[PDB]
Amino acid sequence: MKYMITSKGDEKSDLLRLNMIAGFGYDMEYDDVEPEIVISIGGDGTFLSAFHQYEERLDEIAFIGIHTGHLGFYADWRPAEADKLVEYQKVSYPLLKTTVKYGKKEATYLALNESTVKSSGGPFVVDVVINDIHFERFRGDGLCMSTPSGTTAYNKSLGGALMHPSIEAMQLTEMASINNRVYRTIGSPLVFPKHHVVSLQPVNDKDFQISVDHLSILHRDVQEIRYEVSAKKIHFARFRSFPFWRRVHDSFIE
Amino acid sequence: KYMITSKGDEKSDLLRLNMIAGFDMEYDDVEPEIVISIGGDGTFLSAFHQYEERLDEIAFIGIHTGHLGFYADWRPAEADQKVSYPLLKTTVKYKEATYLALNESTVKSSGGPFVVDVVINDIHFERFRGDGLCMSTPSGTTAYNKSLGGALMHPSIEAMQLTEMASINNRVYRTIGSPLVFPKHHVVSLQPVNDKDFQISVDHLSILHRDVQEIRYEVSAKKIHFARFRSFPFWRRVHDSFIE
Amino acid sequence: MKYMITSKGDEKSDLLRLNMIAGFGEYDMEYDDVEPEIVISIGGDGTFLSAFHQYEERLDEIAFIGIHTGHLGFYADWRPAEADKLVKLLAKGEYQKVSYPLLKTTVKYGIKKEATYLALNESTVKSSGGPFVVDVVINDIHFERFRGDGLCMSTPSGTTAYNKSLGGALMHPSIEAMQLTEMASINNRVYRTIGSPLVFPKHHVVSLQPVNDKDFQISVDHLSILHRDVQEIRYEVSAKKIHFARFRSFPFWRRVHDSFIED
Amino acid sequence: MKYMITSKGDEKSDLLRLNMIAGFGEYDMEYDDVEPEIVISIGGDGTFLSAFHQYEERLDEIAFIGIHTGHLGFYADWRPAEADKLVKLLAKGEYQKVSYPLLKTTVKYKEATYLALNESTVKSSGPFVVDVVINDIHFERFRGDGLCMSTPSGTTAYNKSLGGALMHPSIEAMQLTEMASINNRVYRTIGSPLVFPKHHVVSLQPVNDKDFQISVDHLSILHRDVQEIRYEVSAKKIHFARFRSFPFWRRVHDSFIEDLEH
Numbered sequence A: 001m002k003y004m005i006t007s008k009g010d011e012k013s014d015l016l017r018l019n020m021i022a023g024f025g026y027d028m029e030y031d032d033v034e035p036e037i038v039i040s041i042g043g044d045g046t047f048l049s050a051f052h053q054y055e056e057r058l059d060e061i062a063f064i065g066i067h068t069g070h071l072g073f074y075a076d077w078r079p080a081e082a083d084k085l086v087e088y089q090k091v092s093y094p095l096l097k098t099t100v101k102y103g104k105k106e107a108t109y110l111a112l113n114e115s116t117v118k119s120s121g122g123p124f125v126v127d128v129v130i131n132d133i134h135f136e137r138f139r140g141d142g143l144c145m146s147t148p149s150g151t152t153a154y155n156k157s158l159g160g161a162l163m164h165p166s167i168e169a170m171q172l173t174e175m176a177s178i179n180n181r182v183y184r185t186i187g188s189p190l191v192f193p194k195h196h197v198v199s200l201q202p203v204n205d206k207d208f209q210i211s212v213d214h215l216s217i218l219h220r221d222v223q224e225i226r227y228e229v230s231a232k233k234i235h236f237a238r239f240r241s242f243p244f245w246r247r248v249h250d251s252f253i254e
Numbered sequence B: 001k002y003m004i005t006s007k008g009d010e011k012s013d014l015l016r017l018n019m020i021a022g023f024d025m026e027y028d029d030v031e032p033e034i035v036i037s038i039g040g041d042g043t044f045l046s047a048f049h050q051y052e053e054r055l056d057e058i059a060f061i062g063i064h065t066g067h068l069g070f071y072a073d074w075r076p077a078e079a080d081q082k083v084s085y086p087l088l089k090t091t092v093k094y095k096e097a098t099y100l101a102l103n104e105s106t107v108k109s110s111g112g113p114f115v116v117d118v119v120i121n122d123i124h125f126e127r128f129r130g131d132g133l134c135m136s137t138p139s140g141t142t143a144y145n146k147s148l149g150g151a152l153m154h155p156s157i158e159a160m161q162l163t164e165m166a167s168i169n170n171r172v173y174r175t176i177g178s179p180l181v182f183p184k185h186h187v188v189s190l191q192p193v194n195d196k197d198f199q200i201s202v203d204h205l206s207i208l209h210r211d212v213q214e215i216r217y218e219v220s221a222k223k224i225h226f227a228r229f230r231s232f233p234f235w236r237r238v239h240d241s242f243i244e
Numbered sequence C: 001m002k003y004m005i006t007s008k009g010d011e012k013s014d015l016l017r018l019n020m021i022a023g024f025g026e027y028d029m030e031y032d033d034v035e036p037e038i039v040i041s042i043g044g045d046g047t048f049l050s051a052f053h054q055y056e057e058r059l060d061e062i063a064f065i066g067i068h069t070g071h072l073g074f075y076a077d078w079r080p081a082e083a084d085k086l087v088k089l090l091a092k093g094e095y096q097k098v099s100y101p102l103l104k105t106t107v108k109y110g111i112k113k114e115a116t117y118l119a120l121n122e123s124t125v126k127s128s129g130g131p132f133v134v135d136v137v138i139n140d141i142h143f144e145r146f147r148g149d150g151l152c153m154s155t156p157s158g159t160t161a162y163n164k165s166l167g168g169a170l171m172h173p174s175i176e177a178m179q180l181t182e183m184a185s186i187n188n189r190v191y192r193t194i195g196s197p198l199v200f201p202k203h204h205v206v207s208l209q210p211v212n213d214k215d216f217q218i219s220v221d222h223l224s225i226l227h228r229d230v231q232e233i234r235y236e237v238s239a240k241k242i243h244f245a246r247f248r249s250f251p252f253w254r255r256v257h258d259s260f261i262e263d
Numbered sequence D: 001m002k003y004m005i006t007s008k009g010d011e012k013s014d015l016l017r018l019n020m021i022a023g024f025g026e027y028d029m030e031y032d033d034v035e036p037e038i039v040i041s042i043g044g045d046g047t048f049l050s051a052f053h054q055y056e057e058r059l060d061e062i063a064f065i066g067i068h069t070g071h072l073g074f075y076a077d078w079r080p081a082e083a084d085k086l087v088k089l090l091a092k093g094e095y096q097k098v099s100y101p102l103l104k105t106t107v108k109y110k111e112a113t114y115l116a117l118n119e120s121t122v123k124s125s126g127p128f129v130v131d132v133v134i135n136d137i138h139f140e141r142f143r144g145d146g147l148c149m150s151t152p153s154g155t156t157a158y159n160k161s162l163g164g165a166l167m168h169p170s171i172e173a174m175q176l177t178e179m180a181s182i183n184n185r186v187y188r189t190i191g192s193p194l195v196f197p198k199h200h201v202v203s204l205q206p207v208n209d210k211d212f213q214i215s216v217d218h219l220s221i222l223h224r225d226v227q228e229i230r231y232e233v234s235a236k237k238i239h240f241a242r243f244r245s246f247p248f249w250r251r252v253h254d255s256f257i258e259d260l261e262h
């Protein structure tokens, strides 16, 4: 079938890539337009690029991650096992939908790890609105809405909770909240189920640094930033049994 | 067919009498379909553990005589569909003993250090050393779980959350630090290392267990049913409690 | 004696400034922004920080005074309505001086020369884009290899600021120390960090040494500039201290209570 | 000079203890367990804490030494394989002395005072609710499991597990950390750990219940009808015997980070 392979850039990834492509020279044809199997070689950062490269056809693509360096949560296959990889089950992980409104039109984005909103320099002040209901007035560095699979990324470093990627939900964590009598925040991470909409509304400044995984751009004149669990899912190709918690253990505990 | 529990104070007992007077409703504490709690969340917990054997045929209603609770959302000046929340199944192994929790289930030592092996799905995850561990229900996240640094999750999510209690987290006993949220059919097994005497607590019930071989945690198939008359959002209840 | 007054910029602060200057004009007070002995900041903590760095070359000859036109600050503890009593007490010289410790930041390059900075609140170091990875060396001894957003070294008085939002502890400004806090540490198998904030005494040096990237985004009291080809970043408690003019007694813990709990 | 040795209890501690006593049998060392000048602890930090309270009324005439039979401790810095060197070094009388600050715990109901090397915690006997007073000034009303006041050297103990900051023992201060605070509309607490210098008094005053489970280090007691719990940096200090540079941060490193040569 149709497939394609992306590379990190280093010699180890490109050499391993060419080594695998020649292996398919079976009934496998290389195609980067309409692939059925996308293979990422490098790390989680490399895998994220492959996700956004083919986010228009997530329903017809199974992803496979290979790490040339340290173990990743997406790139979970060693280069020494590249021979065996060249008949599988499909595992689906939830994604995050980020919608931005302006003063025009609106923009939507898909996240595999998380989406963060920070200030354009000074203090980040927004009103956190949960399901058309005011919850808190936040003041700090920013806010982080994480995917289940993305909880082991930025979310964890921010003191968030680790969620199993079988749970369809999203998690909101604080970034250096001042948390005083004027700007009282919840402090605890908040996990939202499906059909729940978290709305971030400006108070004074209208310019925000919205980031989606590995892409941070400046959005001017922002009226609203809404978060909710996307209906679209990312599909993986399961060959062996590598449990999520086991993958967490090998990463942080060892 | 229904029944009514009371906290113990005069305000709760007298209000209870008024509700009986209001009720083709036959008062039956044997096989009730409607259980009404009067007092607070603590009183509500007592009503839950009173009928664990018939949680599938009972809809609960909470009335707070004191401050607002997460389970008692009805003011006493209002005595005049079903919503299901997940539960936590706690199994202690020696003949095994099982317990159901509405808020959470914590395991501490019987005096000295608390040292166990955290096993996730028959696979060792970490060796814990500290005060103890806390496995919380979705609805119980706004309780002890929050104080321990745990995350707040909406009760519509069927899962369980494990949080640390003063982990030493060093070379020998490296822990994850972050709270862990486990879905359905996931089993967290806590296995002793040396001392096998632990102070296992289920919600408001803290009992001492001797000769413990294994403590297993998993989301129970049984769910607690509430009676929804109005619409009080979970996040609004969190807002009114911690954000004033 | 010689004095000067800085203003936030709004009408209220500027108005208060002119009236105080006229107030001092009734006594033996000379206005001088070049070599003053008393620097009065009118506005907020941010305004106070600007006045600090404006005269960081003569901190030994200056007693600072903060006046908050808005909400109460940790550096600006005087209300505008007390400006009249402030002038009269300043003119007589009826006040004692209280000293707060400062943080010394030293940046080394691939010999550029060598840059030094003084911080009243804190000094932070982050990357210039990607992952921030450095080796934390405490007193010429390797302590940890850090990977994350960055690191924040705070002064005692600066603990109630960015430090607190990062989970740092609150120290009384009488304690001569500095506090290092983590900024979103990945803290895994490869990059194991302490997690806990670290309080260092005087004469202790925390050296941050690069692993791959030499470019770092260093900020001193929100003066964030890009430093290229960085060889070393050293942290130590400065021998220089900031001097305040004390007329009454506003306890640090009360200022903490009035700011984060209730007022 | 006069010395004594405490033991954990196991075979390793008792055997190593006998070897040292016999080791001092070639030098001018008098063994005395009632009025010693050098107290040696064999076992762990728990053993050291026991040796501290055993001779806490003569802290001015005693320099302590710790030997860890198991993992590295913050008070037991010496290895069992270095016991041979310790005897000769102690006999030669060649060592500088290092002093660590202590925590003074006062319980009023007559007045009871306690000295802590690590920390002093106060819990309930149900909900623990007290009013935290800092220098005769109300700061917050706490509600949770309890409160922990830690010594500088004690910051690496329970204080670290509670999320407190690590302080160098050269700093004469004390640190207050929360224990499972509820922090809501009614009971708003600071959250952050608080570090107090000398001459600063932290007063814990009851709200409803007067009974509290007050613990000082290993000693966990129960005080009834408590009116006030006072915390302040004690004037008394514990003295150590230094032979070689073993930095505090190294002990922190070798305990929480990694120990590659072990």
Ligand SMILES: [N-]=[N+]=NC[C@H]1O[C@@H](n2c(SCC(=O)NCCc3c[nH]c4ccccc34)nc3c(N)ncnc32)[C@H](O)[C@@H]1O
Binding pocket: A119, A121, A122, A123, A124, A139, A140, A141, A175, A176, A177, A178, C046, C121, C122, C161, C162, C163, C165, C221, C222
């Ligand atoms: N604005 N201003 N003045 C700079 C002061 O801001 C304090 N400081 C900072 S400065 C670092 C920064 O760029 N943060 C992005 C958001 C932000 C900038 N300035 C803030 C001031 C208050 C609150 C948020 C910000 N962040 C924080 C922080 N999250 N919570 C508390 N306090 C901070 C820090 O003490 C610094 O000295």
Ligand SMILES: [N-]=[N+]=NC[C@H]1O[C@@H](n2c(SCC(=O)NCCc3c[nH]c4ccccc34)nc3c(N)ncnc32)[C@H](O)[C@@H]1O
Binding pocket: B109, B111, B112, B113, B114, B129, B130, B131, B165, B166, B167, B168, D046, D118, D119, D157, D158, D159, D161, D217, D218, D219, D220
């Ligand atoms: N009782 N007692 N033990 C004395 C030392 O134990 C230290 N201490 C304590 S005492 C409070 C307590 O009952 N903890 C329950 C579990 C436990 C007891 N002792 C431990 C020692 C190490 C680890 C866990 C325990 N907890 C802790 C704590 N989580 N992490 C570190 N160290 C602690 C505390 O500093 C005290 O100095």
Ligand SMILES: [N-]=[N+]=NC[C@H]1O[C@@H](n2c(SCC(=O)NCCc3c[nH]c4ccccc34)nc3c(N)ncnc32)[C@H](O)[C@@H]1O
Binding pocket: B042, B103, B104, B140, B143, B144, B145, B147, B203, B204, B205, D124, D126, D127, D128, D143, D144, D145, D179, D180, D181, D182
């Ligand atoms: N036992 N009991 N009561 C039942 C509920 O009390 C809730 N729960 C507890 S019970 C554990 C305990 O023994 N804590 C000592 C102090 C305490 C006891 N009950 C409390 C209730 C509120 C606040 C403090 C206590 N602690 C906590 C906690 N620190 N912050 C929040 N909520 C808690 C917990 O959810 C439990 O299910």
Ligand SMILES: [N-]=[N+]=NC[C@H]1O[C@@H](n2c(SCC(=O)NCCc3c[nH]c4ccccc34)nc3c(N)ncnc32)[C@H](O)[C@@H]1O
Binding pocket: A044, A045, A048, A113, A114, A153, A154, A155, A157, A212, A213, A214, C127, C129, C130, C131, C132, C147, C148, C149, C183, C184, C185, C186
């Ligand atoms: N790897 N990679 N690509 C970007 C991903 O990196 C993850 N991500 C980030 S991105 C936010 C950021 O700019 N942080 C500054 C330093 C940094 C950039 N990328 C990093 C990757 C690992 C560690 C630090 C950085 N920070 C973090 C974080 N502290 N700990 C864990 N993971 C993070 C985040 O999930 C993002 O999706």
